[PDB]
Short mmCIF file of C-alpha atoms and ligand atoms in Angstrom, two decimals:
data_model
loop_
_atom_site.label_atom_id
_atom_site.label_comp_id
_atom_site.label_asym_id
_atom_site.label_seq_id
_atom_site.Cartn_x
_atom_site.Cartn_y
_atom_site.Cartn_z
CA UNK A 281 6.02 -2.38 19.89
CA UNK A 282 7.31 -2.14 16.13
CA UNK A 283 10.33 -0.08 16.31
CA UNK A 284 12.50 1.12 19.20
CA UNK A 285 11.90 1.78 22.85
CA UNK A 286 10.26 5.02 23.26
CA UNK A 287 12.71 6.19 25.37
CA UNK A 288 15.50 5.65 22.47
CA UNK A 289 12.77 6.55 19.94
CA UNK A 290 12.97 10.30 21.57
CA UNK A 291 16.90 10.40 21.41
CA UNK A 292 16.71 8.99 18.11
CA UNK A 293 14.69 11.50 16.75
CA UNK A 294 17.30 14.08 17.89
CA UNK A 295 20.12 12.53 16.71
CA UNK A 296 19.00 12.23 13.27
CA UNK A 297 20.11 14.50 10.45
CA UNK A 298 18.10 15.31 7.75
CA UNK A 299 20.03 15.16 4.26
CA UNK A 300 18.23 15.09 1.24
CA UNK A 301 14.22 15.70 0.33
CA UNK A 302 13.40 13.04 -2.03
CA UNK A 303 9.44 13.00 -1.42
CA UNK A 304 6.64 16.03 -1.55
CA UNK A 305 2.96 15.68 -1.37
CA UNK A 306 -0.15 16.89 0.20
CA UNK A 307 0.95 14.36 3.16
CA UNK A 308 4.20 16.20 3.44
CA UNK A 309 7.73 15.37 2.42
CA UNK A 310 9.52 12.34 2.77
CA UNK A 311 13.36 12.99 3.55
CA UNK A 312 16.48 10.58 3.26
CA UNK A 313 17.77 10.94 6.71
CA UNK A 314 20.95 10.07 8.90
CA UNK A 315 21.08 8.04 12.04
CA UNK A 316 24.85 7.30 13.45
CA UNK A 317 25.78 7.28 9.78
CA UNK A 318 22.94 4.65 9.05
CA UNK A 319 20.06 5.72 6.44
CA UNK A 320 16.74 6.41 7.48
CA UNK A 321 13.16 7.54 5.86
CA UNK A 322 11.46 10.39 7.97
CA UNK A 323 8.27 11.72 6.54
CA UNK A 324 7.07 14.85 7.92
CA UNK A 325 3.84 15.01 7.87
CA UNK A 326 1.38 18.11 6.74
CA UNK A 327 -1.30 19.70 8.80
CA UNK A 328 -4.13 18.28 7.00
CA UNK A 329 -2.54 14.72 7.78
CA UNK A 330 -1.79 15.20 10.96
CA UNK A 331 -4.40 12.75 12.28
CA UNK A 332 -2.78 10.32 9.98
CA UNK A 333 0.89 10.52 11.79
CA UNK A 334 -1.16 10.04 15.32
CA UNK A 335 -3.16 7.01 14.27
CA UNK A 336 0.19 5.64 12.68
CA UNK A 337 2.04 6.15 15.47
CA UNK A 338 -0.02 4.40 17.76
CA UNK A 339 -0.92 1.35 15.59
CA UNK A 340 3.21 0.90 15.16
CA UNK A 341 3.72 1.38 18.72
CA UNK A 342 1.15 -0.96 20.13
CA UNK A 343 1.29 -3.53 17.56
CA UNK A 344 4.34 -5.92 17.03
CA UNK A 345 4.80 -4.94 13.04
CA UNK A 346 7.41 -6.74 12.16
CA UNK A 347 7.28 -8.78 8.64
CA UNK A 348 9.53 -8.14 5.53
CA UNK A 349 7.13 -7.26 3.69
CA UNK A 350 5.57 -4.26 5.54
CA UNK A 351 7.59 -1.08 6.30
CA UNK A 352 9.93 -0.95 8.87
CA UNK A 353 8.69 1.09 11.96
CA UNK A 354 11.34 2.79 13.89
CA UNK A 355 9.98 5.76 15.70
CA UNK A 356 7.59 8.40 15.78
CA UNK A 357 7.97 12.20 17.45
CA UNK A 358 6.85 15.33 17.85
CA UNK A 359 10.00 17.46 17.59
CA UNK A 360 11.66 21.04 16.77
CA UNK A 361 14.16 21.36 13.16
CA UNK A 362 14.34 24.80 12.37
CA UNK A 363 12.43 26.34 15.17
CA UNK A 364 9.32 24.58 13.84
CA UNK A 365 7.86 21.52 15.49
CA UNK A 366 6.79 18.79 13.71
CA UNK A 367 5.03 15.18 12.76
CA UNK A 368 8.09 12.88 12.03
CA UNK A 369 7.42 9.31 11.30
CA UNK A 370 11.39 7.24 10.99
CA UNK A 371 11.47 3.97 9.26
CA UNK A 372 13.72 2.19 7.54
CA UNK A 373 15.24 3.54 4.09
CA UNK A 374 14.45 2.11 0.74
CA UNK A 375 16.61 3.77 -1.58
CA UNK A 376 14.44 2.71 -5.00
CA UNK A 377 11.32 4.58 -3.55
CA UNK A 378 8.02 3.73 -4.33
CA UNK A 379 6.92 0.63 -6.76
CA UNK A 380 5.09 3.97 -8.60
CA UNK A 381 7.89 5.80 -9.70
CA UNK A 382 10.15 2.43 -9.90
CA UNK A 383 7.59 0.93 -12.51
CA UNK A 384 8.29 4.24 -14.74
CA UNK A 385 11.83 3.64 -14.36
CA UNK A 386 12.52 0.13 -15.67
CA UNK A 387 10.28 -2.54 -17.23
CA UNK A 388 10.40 -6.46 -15.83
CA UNK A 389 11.42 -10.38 -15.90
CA UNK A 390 9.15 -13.37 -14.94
CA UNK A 391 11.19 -13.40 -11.76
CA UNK A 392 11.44 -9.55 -10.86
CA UNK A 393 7.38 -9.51 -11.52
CA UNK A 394 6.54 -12.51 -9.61
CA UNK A 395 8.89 -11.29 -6.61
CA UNK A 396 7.44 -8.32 -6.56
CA UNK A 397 3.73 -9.42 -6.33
CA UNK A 398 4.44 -11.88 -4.03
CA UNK A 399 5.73 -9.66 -1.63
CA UNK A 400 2.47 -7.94 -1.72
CA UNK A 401 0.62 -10.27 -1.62
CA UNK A 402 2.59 -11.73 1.65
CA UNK A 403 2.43 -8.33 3.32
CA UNK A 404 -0.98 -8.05 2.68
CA UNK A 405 -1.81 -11.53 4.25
CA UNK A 406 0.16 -10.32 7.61
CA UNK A 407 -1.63 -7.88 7.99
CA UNK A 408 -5.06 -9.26 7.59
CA UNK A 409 -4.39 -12.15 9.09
CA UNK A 410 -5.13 -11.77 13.44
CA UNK A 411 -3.01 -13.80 15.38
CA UNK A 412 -4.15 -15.04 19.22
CA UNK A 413 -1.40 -14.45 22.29
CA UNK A 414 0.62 -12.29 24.28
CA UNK A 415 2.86 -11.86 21.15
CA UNK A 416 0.12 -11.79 17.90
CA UNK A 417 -1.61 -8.74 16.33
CA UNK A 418 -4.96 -7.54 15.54
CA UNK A 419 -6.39 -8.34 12.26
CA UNK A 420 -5.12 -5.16 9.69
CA UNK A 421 -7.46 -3.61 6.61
CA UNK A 422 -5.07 -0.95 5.47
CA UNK A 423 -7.79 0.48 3.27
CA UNK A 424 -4.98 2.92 0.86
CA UNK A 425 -3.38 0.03 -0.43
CA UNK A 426 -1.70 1.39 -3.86
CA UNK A 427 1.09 1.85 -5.78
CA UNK A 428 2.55 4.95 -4.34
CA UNK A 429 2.25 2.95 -0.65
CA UNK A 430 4.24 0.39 -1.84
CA UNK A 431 8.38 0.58 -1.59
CA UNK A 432 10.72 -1.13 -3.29
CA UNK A 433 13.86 -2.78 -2.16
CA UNK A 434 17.08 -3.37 -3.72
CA UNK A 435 16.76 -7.37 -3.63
CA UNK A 436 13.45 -6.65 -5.57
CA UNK A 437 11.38 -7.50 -2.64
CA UNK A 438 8.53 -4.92 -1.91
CA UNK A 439 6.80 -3.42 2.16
CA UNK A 440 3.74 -2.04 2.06
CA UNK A 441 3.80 1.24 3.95
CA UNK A 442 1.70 4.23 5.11
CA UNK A 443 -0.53 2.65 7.44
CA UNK A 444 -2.37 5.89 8.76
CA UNK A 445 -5.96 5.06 7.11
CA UNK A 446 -5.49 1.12 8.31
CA UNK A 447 -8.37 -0.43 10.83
CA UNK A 448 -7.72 -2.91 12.75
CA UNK A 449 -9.93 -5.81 14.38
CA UNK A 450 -9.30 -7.64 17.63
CA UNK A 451 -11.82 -10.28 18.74
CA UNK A 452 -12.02 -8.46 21.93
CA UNK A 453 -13.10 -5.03 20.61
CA UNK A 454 -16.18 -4.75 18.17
CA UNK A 455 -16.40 -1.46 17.47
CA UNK A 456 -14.27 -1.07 13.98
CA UNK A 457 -12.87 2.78 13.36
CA UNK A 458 -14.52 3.11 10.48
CA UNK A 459 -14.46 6.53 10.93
CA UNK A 460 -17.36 8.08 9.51
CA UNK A 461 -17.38 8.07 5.58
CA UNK A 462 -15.59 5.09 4.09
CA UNK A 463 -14.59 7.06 1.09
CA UNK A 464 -11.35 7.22 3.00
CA UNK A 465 -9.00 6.06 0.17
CA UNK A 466 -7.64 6.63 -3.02
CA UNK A 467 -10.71 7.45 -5.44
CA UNK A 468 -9.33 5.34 -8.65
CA UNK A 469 -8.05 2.54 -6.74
CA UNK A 470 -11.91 2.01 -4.09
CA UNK A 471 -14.19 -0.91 -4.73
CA UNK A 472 -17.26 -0.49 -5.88
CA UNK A 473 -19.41 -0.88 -2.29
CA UNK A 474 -17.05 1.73 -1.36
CA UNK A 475 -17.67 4.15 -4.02
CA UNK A 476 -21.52 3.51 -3.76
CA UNK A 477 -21.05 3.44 -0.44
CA UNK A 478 -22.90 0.22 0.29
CA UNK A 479 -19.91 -1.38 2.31
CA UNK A 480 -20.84 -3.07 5.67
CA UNK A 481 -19.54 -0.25 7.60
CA UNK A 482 -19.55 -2.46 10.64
CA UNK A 483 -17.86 -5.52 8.58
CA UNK A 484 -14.44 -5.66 9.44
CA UNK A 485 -14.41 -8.09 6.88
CA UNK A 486 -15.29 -5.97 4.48
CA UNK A 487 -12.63 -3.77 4.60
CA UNK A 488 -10.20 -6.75 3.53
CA UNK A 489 -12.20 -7.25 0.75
CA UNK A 490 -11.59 -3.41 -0.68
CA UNK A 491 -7.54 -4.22 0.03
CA UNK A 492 -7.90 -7.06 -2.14
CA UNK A 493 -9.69 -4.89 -4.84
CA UNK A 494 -6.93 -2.24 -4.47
CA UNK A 495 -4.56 -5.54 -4.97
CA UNK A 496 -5.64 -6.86 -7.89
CA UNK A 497 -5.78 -2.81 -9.51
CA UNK A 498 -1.64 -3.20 -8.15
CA UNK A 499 -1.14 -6.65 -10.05
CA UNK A 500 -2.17 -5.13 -13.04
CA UNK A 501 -0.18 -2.03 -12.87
CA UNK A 502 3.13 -4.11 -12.07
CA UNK A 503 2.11 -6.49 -15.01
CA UNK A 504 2.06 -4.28 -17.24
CA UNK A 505 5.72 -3.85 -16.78
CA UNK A 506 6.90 -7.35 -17.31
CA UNK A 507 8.54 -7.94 -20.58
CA UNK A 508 7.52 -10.70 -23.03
CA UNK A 509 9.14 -11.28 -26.34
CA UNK A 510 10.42 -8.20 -25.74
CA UNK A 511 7.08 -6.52 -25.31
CA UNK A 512 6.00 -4.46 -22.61
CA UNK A 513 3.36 -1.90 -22.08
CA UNK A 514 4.28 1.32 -20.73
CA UNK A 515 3.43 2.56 -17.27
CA UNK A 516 -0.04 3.79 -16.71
CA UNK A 517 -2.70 4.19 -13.46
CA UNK A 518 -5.53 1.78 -13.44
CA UNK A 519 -8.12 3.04 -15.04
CA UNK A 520 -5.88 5.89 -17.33
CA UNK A 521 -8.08 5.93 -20.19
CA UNK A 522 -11.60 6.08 -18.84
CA UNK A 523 -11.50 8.45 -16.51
CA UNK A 524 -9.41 12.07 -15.58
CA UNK A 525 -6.16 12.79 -13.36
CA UNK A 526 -7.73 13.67 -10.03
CA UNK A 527 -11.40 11.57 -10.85
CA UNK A 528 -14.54 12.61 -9.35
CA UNK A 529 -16.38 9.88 -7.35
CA UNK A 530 -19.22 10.16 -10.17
CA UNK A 531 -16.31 9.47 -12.78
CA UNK A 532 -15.53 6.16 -10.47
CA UNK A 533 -18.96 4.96 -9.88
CA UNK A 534 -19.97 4.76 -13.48
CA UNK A 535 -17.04 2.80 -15.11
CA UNK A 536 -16.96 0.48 -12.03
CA UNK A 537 -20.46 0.14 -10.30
CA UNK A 538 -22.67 1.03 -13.16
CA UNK A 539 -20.79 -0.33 -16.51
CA UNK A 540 -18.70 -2.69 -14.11
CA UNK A 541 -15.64 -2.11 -16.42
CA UNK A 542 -12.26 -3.37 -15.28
CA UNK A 543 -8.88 -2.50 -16.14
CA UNK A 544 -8.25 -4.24 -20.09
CA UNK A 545 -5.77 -6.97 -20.42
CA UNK A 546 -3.09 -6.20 -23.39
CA UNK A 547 -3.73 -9.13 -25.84
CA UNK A 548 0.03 -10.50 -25.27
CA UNK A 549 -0.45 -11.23 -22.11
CA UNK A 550 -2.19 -14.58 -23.59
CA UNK A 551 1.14 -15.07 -25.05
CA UNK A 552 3.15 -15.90 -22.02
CA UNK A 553 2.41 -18.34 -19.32
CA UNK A 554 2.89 -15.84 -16.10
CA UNK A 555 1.30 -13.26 -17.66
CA UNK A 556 -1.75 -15.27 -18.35
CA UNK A 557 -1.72 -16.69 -15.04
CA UNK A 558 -1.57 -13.11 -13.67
CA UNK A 559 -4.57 -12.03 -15.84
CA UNK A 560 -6.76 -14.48 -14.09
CA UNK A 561 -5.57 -13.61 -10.74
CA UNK A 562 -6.44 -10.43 -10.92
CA UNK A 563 -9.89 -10.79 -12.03
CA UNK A 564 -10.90 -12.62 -9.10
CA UNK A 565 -9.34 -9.69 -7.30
CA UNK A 566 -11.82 -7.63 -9.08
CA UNK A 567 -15.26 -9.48 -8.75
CA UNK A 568 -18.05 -7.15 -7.88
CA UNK A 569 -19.26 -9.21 -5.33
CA UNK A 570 -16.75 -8.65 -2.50
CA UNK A 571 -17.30 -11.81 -0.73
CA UNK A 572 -16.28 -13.75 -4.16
CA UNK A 573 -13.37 -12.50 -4.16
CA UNK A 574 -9.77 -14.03 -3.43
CA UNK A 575 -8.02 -14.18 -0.02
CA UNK A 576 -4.78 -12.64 0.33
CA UNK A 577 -3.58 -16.24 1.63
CA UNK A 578 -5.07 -17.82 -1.41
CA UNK A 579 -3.40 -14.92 -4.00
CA UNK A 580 -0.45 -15.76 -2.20
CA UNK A 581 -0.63 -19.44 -2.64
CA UNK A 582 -1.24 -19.47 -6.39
CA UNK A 583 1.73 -17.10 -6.57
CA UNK A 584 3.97 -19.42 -5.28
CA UNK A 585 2.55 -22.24 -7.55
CA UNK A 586 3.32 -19.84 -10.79
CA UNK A 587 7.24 -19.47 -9.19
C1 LIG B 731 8.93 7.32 6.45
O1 LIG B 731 7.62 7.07 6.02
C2 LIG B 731 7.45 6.83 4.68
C3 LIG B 731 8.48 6.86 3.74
C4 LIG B 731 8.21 6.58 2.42
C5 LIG B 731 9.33 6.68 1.43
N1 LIG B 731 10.56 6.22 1.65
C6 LIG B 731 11.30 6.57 0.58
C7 LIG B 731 12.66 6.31 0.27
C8 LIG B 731 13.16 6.79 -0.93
C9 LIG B 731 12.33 7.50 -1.79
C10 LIG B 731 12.94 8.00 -3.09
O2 LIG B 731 12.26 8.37 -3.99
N2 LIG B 731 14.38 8.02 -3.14
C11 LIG B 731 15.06 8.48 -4.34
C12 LIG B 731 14.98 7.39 -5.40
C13 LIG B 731 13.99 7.78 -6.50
N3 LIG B 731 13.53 6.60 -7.20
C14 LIG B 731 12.14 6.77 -7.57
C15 LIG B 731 14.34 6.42 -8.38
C16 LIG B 731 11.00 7.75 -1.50
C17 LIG B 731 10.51 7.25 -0.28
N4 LIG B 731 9.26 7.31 0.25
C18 LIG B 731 8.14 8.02 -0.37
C19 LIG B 731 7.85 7.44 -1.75
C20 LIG B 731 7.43 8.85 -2.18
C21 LIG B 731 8.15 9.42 -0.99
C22 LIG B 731 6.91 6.32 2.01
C23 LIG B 731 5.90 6.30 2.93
O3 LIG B 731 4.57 6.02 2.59
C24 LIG B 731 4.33 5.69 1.26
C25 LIG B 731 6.17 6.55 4.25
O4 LIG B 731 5.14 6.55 5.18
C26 LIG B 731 5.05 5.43 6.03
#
């Protein structure tokens, strides 16, 4: 699969050293770890996510997951520290964290921006993209697609990580994991058909079509951050001002399905070619009809036409 064998993946897990805590959530803590002297990410994952850590596991061990743009899978245990057993997912280290708490750090150039959505945008297309053979995947909807599941790497490159929610779609199987309600996510960052719960539940599809929702939500959060004339805005979540911390799927439905309101574009973007360019991508992220809306190979594509 992804990461190691599973017969190193076991010793591996032993021989690591935990070091510093640098991550804690209601899906656990996130630890800088040491392997051989090497850096590694090991989140340890809470009870109530549990089922998260199994479904993760198996995608990364089953699936060839290898892309620079998606997290780097390199084992999964069960295992004792402390007399206490527990979930441990191991992947590889990104010392910057998560493009959340990096965008509330430091503000952006045309090329730091662009690299940054790009690499999205490219992880995003491997993973929805199903590839034939002995060596291809199944096609991937990762359906939690955010900020905070996006890491940052020191050549400003970006993975996408945290692939516990993800479906997946092989031309053999039909029957999608769905799994019941599709209100799976993220409440601020679901499409409307998810909030109103009017998806094609059976559309595999359709679940690429809330990613690219969730996408365009990320372009504008990143944009945001990219300096012009020495302007920036600061830092916020989409949809800060219209609705609370923690929003109530009533909150989300009426800004987005009812009043169809988007995300606002600061005026200045119209002052800078990128930024304008950007603004237009991410409204055909954000059409209410799901099938009008981009692909990630096309978001991709006009990327690399703006640089
Ligand atoms: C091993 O599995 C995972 C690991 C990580 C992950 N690696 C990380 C590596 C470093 C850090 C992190 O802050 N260093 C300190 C630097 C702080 N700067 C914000 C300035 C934080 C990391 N984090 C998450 C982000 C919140 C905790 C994230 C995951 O899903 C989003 C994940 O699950 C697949």
């Amino acid at each position: 699969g992804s990461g190691l064998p599973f017969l190193v993946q076991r010793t591996v897990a032993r021989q690591i050293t935990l070091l510093e805590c640098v991550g804690k959530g209601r899906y656990g803590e996130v630890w800088r770890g040491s392997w051989q002297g090497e850096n590694v990410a090991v989140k340890i994952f809470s009870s109530r996510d549990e089922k998260s850590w199994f479904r993760e596991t198996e995608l990364y061990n089953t699936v060839m997951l290898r892309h620079e743009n998606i997290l780097g899978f390199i084992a999964s245990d069960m295992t004792s520290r402390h007399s206490s057993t527990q979930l441990w997912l191991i992947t590889h280290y990104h010392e910057m964290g998560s493009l959340y708490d990096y965008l509330q750090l430091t503000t952006l150039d045309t090329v730091s921006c662009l690299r940054i959505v790009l690499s999205i945008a490219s992880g995003l297309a491997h993973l929805h993209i199903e590839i034939f053979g002995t060596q291809g995947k199944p096609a991937i909807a990762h359906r939690d697609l955010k900020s905070k599941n996006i890491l940052v790497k020191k050549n400003g490159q970006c993975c996408i990580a945290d692939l516990g929610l993800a479906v997946m779609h092989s031309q053999s199987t039909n029957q999608l994991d769905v799994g019941n309600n599709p209100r799976v996510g993220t409440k601020r960052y679901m499409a409307p058909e998810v909030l109103d719960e009017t998806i094609q539940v059976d559309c595999f599809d359709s679940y690429k079509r809330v990613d690219i929702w969730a996408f365009g939500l990320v372009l504008w959060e990143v944009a945001r951050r990219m300096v012009s004339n020495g302007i920036v805005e600061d830092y916020k979540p989409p949809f800060y001002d219209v609705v609370p911390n923690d929003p109530s799927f009533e909150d989300m439905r009426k800004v987005v399905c009812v009043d169809q309101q988007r995300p606002n574009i600061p005026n200045r973007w119209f002052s800078d070619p990128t930024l304008t360019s950007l603004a237009k991508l991410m409204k055909e992220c954000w059409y209410q009809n799901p099938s009008a809306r981009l692909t990630a190979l096309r978001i991709k594509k006009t990327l690399t036409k703006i640089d």
